[PDB]
Design an enzyme around this catalytic site. Structure first.
Site, PDB file in Angstrom:
ATOM      1  N   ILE A  24       0.762  -1.139   0.026  1.00  0.00           N
ATOM      2  CA  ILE A  24      -0.060  -0.263   0.182  1.00  0.00           C
ATOM      3  C   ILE A  24       0.994   1.326  -0.073  1.00  0.00           C
ATOM      4  O   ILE A  24       0.530   2.123  -0.762  1.00  0.00           O
ATOM      5  CB  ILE A  24      -0.721   0.030   1.221  1.00  0.00           C
ATOM      6  N   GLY A  25       1.832   1.382   0.787  1.00  0.00           N
ATOM      7  CA  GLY A  25       2.817   2.319   0.782  1.00  0.00           C
ATOM      8  C   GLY A  25       3.927   2.217   1.925  1.00  0.00           C
ATOM      9  O   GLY A  25       3.911   1.199   2.342  1.00  0.00           O
ATOM     10  N   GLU A  26       4.793   3.254   2.049  1.00  0.00           N
ATOM     11  CA  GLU A  26       5.790   2.919   2.937  1.00  0.00           C
ATOM     12  C   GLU A  26       7.038   4.043   3.068  1.00  0.00           C
ATOM     13  O   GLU A  26       7.883   4.375   2.221  1.00  0.00           O
ATOM     14  CB  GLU A  26       6.545   1.721   2.486  1.00  0.00           C
ATOM     15  N   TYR A  29      10.043   3.804   8.919  1.00  0.00           N
ATOM     16  CA  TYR A  29       9.547   2.494   9.911  1.00  0.00           C
ATOM     17  C   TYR A  29       8.357   2.727   9.675  1.00  0.00           C
ATOM     18  O   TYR A  29       7.297   2.670  10.746  1.00  0.00           O
ATOM     19  CB  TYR A  29      10.310   2.763  11.255  1.00  0.00           C
ATOM     20  N   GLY A  30       7.733   2.608   8.433  1.00  0.00           N
ATOM     21  CA  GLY A  30       6.414   2.605   7.906  1.00  0.00           C
ATOM     22  C   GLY A  30       5.920   2.313   6.931  1.00  0.00           C
ATOM     23  O   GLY A  30       5.613   2.886   5.975  1.00  0.00           O
ATOM     24  N   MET A  31       5.657   0.914   6.717  1.00  0.00           N
ATOM     25  CA  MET A  31       5.360   0.115   5.292  1.00  0.00           C
ATOM     26  C   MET A  31       3.822  -0.365   5.452  1.00  0.00           C
ATOM     27  O   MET A  31       3.841  -1.158   6.646  1.00  0.00           O
ATOM     28  CB  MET A  31       6.300  -0.849   4.952  1.00  0.00           C
ATOM     29  N   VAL A  32       2.922  -0.002   4.764  1.00  0.00           N
ATOM     30  CA  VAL A  32       1.533  -0.635   5.010  1.00  0.00           C
ATOM     31  C   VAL A  32       1.211  -1.689   3.985  1.00  0.00           C
ATOM     32  O   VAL A  32       1.721  -1.386   2.815  1.00  0.00           O
ATOM     33  CB  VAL A  32       0.644   0.499   4.989  1.00  0.00           C
ATOM     34  N   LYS A  47       0.659  -2.138   9.382  1.00  0.00           N
ATOM     35  CA  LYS A  47       1.801  -1.510   9.272  1.00  0.00           C
ATOM     36  C   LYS A  47       3.210  -1.893   9.970  1.00  0.00           C
ATOM     37  O   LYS A  47       3.082  -2.132  11.172  1.00  0.00           O
ATOM     38  CB  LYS A  47       1.518   0.236   9.739  1.00  0.00           C
ATOM     39  N   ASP A 142      -3.412  17.150  14.468  1.00  0.00           N
ATOM     40  CA  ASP A 142      -2.713  16.773  13.089  1.00  0.00           C
ATOM     41  C   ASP A 142      -3.845  16.332  12.330  1.00  0.00           C
ATOM     42  O   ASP A 142      -3.705  15.513  11.409  1.00  0.00           O
ATOM     43  CB  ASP A 142      -1.637  15.955  12.969  1.00  0.00           C
TER      44      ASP A 142
HETATM   45  N1  LIG Z   1      -6.773   1.530   8.806  1.00  0.00           N
HETATM   46  C1  LIG Z   1      -6.068   1.591   7.629  1.00  0.00           C
HETATM   47  N2  LIG Z   1      -6.501   1.240   6.422  1.00  0.00           N
HETATM   48  C2  LIG Z   1      -5.800   1.477   5.370  1.00  0.00           C
HETATM   49  C3  LIG Z   1      -4.760   2.142   5.150  1.00  0.00           C
HETATM   50  C4  LIG Z   1      -4.004   2.620   6.492  1.00  0.00           C
HETATM   51  C5  LIG Z   1      -3.071   3.420   7.040  1.00  0.00           C
HETATM   52  C6  LIG Z   1      -1.974   2.950   7.816  1.00  0.00           C
HETATM   53  C7  LIG Z   1      -2.193   2.135   9.086  1.00  0.00           C
HETATM   54  C8  LIG Z   1      -1.363   2.827  10.366  1.00  0.00           C
HETATM   55  C9  LIG Z   1      -1.438   1.742  11.193  1.00  0.00           C
HETATM   56  C10 LIG Z   1      -1.713   0.506  11.068  1.00  0.00           C
HETATM   57  F1  LIG Z   1      -1.848  -0.465  12.210  1.00  0.00           F
HETATM   58  C11 LIG Z   1      -2.256  -0.044   9.986  1.00  0.00           C
HETATM   59  C12 LIG Z   1      -2.347   0.817   9.059  1.00  0.00           C
HETATM   60  N3  LIG Z   1      -0.859   4.130   7.802  1.00  0.00           N
HETATM   61  C13 LIG Z   1      -1.365   4.609   6.949  1.00  0.00           C
HETATM   62  N4  LIG Z   1      -2.713   4.546   6.109  1.00  0.00           N
HETATM   63  C14 LIG Z   1      -3.458   5.472   5.072  1.00  0.00           C
HETATM   64  C15 LIG Z   1      -4.084   6.651   5.972  1.00  0.00           C
HETATM   65  C16 LIG Z   1      -4.859   7.571   4.664  1.00  0.00           C
HETATM   66  N5  LIG Z   1      -3.958   8.046   3.859  1.00  0.00           N
HETATM   67  C17 LIG Z   1      -2.849   6.970   3.029  1.00  0.00           C
HETATM   68  C18 LIG Z   1      -2.418   5.872   4.004  1.00  0.00           C
HETATM   69  N6  LIG Z   1      -4.910   2.542   7.882  1.00  0.00           N
END
Ligand SMILES: Nc1nccc(-c2c(-c3ccc(F)cc3)ncn2C2CCNCC2)n1
Length: 350
Positions: A24-26, A29-32, A47, A142
């Protein structure tokens, strides 16, 4: 996926329970990735974070996990689970699992135009969520469209409490031109003037910005840099009154304002001719220059624009208002790792 499953060259070790990943993205220390929760038969969002090398990142991770685990509300994303090694020694990464929310208000707006009924419902949910947050004595700090998750059924959930703080109105004053980390466009005017952003009114201003944005699909005060943001706000609200200036005591901030040419207020019905009059009236009360005269979350909910949704008995408040024992970021990454380990223990299959 064999030993440790892999995602775009990075190990995304979400064990057995979660499968059928998808990137989904990254950003750091944040890759989803979205995965399949075999237990609940629903694709979730996960994440991966590795903040143990840096004390700061350990602060936002600890602080947000605590808040998110303590909070229980329909309009605030919850943590469904948290994956991490069985030993502090072996814990390098941490996976947090949340409901899968297809999109968010930022993406929605950059493609769809909202009907007044969607803006109303969205705003209602935003404030219903904020009322809970504030009731817990916490400030999000934020709020912006990208931080409002949405699913296919218009269900809205506030997320991203990485910059959230326990309210502290007494220790809110600071100097003029004091650095801030929250997203620029939704920052209240007092942040560039004299506020540390430790007051609830700071979140209401952001919500006001989101409202204007929902009304026109464009950010209302898109400042290029620090002081530009302020001229953007004054360009529409116009020059602050004597009263509102007499409040600003920080001599420098006040003198700056006085040095500026006079600017008249721009009517909202001019900015948004398609807007609903009740909406623009609430927008006005939210985008109020003086924080003390800015409408409160509960007053906002009770506003005529939200008449068809307002129901105090159906707008819950926190059972246990927040208190951050390790308040003030003075903890070494070591101690922080133990707290995060300890905070995430409840989800351990052990
Ligand atoms: N619930 C949910 N669903 C889809 C994407 C995200 C998410 C996370 C994230 C964070 C913590 C976690 F435990 C799991 C995922 N970080 C960013 N985003 C999105 C938030 C809206 N803009 C694009 C990225 N969160």
């Amino acid at each position: 996926a064999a030993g440790p499953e892999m995602v775009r060259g990075q190990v995304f070790d979400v064990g057995p329970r979660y499968t059928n990943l998808s990137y989904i993205g990254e950003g750091a220390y944040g890759m989803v990735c979205s995965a399949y929760d075999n237990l609940n038969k629903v694709r979730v969002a996960i994440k991966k974070i590795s903040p143990f090398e840096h004390q700061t990142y350990c602060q936002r991770t600890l602080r947000e996990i605590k808040i998110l685990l303590r909070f229980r509300h329909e309009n605030i994303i919850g943590i469904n689970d948290i994956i991490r090694a069985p030993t502090i020694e072996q814990m390098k990464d941490v996976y947090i699992v949340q409901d899968l929310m297809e999109t968010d208000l930022y993406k929605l707006l950059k493609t769809q135009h909202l009907s007044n009924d969607h803006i109303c419902y969205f705003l209602y949910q935003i404030l219903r969520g904020l009322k809970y947050i504030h009731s817990a004595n916490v400030l999000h700090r934020d709020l912006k469209p990208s931080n409002l998750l949405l699913n296919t059924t218009c269900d809205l959930k506030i997320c991203d409490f990485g910059l959230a703080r326990v309210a502290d109105p007494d220790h809110d004053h600071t100097g003029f031109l004091t650095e801030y980390v929250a997203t620029r466009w939704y920052r209240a005017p007092e942040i560039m003037l004299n506020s540390k952003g430790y007051t609830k009114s700071i979140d209401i201003w952001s919500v006001g910005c989101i409202l204007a944005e929902m009304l026109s699909n464009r950010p209302i005060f898109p400042g290029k840099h620090y002081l530009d943001q302020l001229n953007h706000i004054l360009g529409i609200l116009g020059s602050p009154s004597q009263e509102d200036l007499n409040c600003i005591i920080n001599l420098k901030a006040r003198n700056y304002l006085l040095s500026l040419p006079h600017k008249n207020k721009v009517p909202w019905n001019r900015l948004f001719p398609n807007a609903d009059s009740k909406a623009l009236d609430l927008l006005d009360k939210m985008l109020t220059f003086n924080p003390h005269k800015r409408i409160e979350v509960e007053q906002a909910l009770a506003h005529p624009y939200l008449e068809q949704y307002y129901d105090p008995s159906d707008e819950p408040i926190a059972e246990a208002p927040f208190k951050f024992d390790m308040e003030l970021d003075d903890l070494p990454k070591e101690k922080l790792k133990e707290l995060i380990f300890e905070e995430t223990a409840r989800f351990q299959p052990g």
